[PDB]
Ligand binder design. Structure first.
Ligand SMILES: [Cl-]
Ligand SMILES: [Cl-]
Ligand SMILES: [Cl-]
Ligand SMILES: [Cl-]
Ligand SMILES: [Cl-]
Lengths: 148, 143
């Protein structure tokens, strides 16, 4: 987006501001930072529920669905893992555009701060099983502008 | 052990959402664009003729209350009729907040835009008032 058009704000300016205000929401940033802090950068809804035990599934889905609709989060369907009852078959990753948006509001580097907190978090057998599923997608974050 | 943020976090998000507002960003960019870095309400009304004075003043007052803009009283100039006696400047904290939302760098383009703004003689006279305070955004931006 240009800075100006004929000395005025460019046409999509107000919509860009709305997009930036949208991402500046504590539960949405919790989701985005949790995803980014995970070593392979993907999480299922079941895993997000575990990390956010004060929120309802309905509320978490509402924020994830909104994030996907806006192109900030990518919905990745995956096969059924053979080893596990009722495994997650959808995982979520942050997109290149989402990383760009987080950088624009100075909320991207904040994710790294939380890696060791989630690495050390106490896990149930079920969460350990999900974190080790063979069907977790492999996302190339380097190509999405992530810091290495 | 699953991540608690402080309450300070929610308040910082709210501060960032507050500044991501087109009229407020227009005010801030207009102030930063001015070569001496200060503007009167008369000068802001001139630049934002589609806004009501009450609404423009609302935005300025909200920016001052949050410490993003500084209100600076000055003496009454002898040289012009009914001169402004309050000028507004962006604060150090306001610069830090604009940088946090990626809105500070573009101030150089706005300077260039506003250099080309058509001026009335009244606005010219106000721009040359001896009572205009002096602010240095290089110093405020570094501290
Ligand atoms: Cl431009
Ligand atoms: Cl799930
Ligand atoms: Cl960042
Ligand atoms: Cl005035
Ligand atoms: Cl900036």
């Amino acid at each position: 987006m240009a800075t100006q058009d004929r000395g005025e704000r460019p046409n999509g300016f107000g919509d860009e501001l709305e997009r930036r205000r949208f991402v500046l929401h504590e539960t949405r940033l919790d989701v985005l930072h949790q995803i980014l802090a995970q070593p392979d950068g993907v999480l299922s809804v079941e895993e997000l529920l575990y990390r956010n035990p004060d929120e309802t599934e309905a509320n978490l889905r509402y924020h994830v669905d909104e994030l996907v609709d806006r192109g900030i989060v990518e919905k990745i369907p995956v096969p059924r893992a053979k080893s596990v009852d009722d495994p997650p078959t959808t995982f979520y990753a942050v997109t290149g555009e989402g990383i760009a948006l987080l950088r624009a509001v100075s909320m991207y580097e904040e994710a790294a701060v939380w890696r060791s907190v989630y690495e050390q978090m106490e896990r149930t057998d079920r969460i350990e099983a999900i974190e080790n599923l063979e069907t977790r997608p492999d996302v190339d974050y380097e190509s999405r502008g992530a810091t290495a």
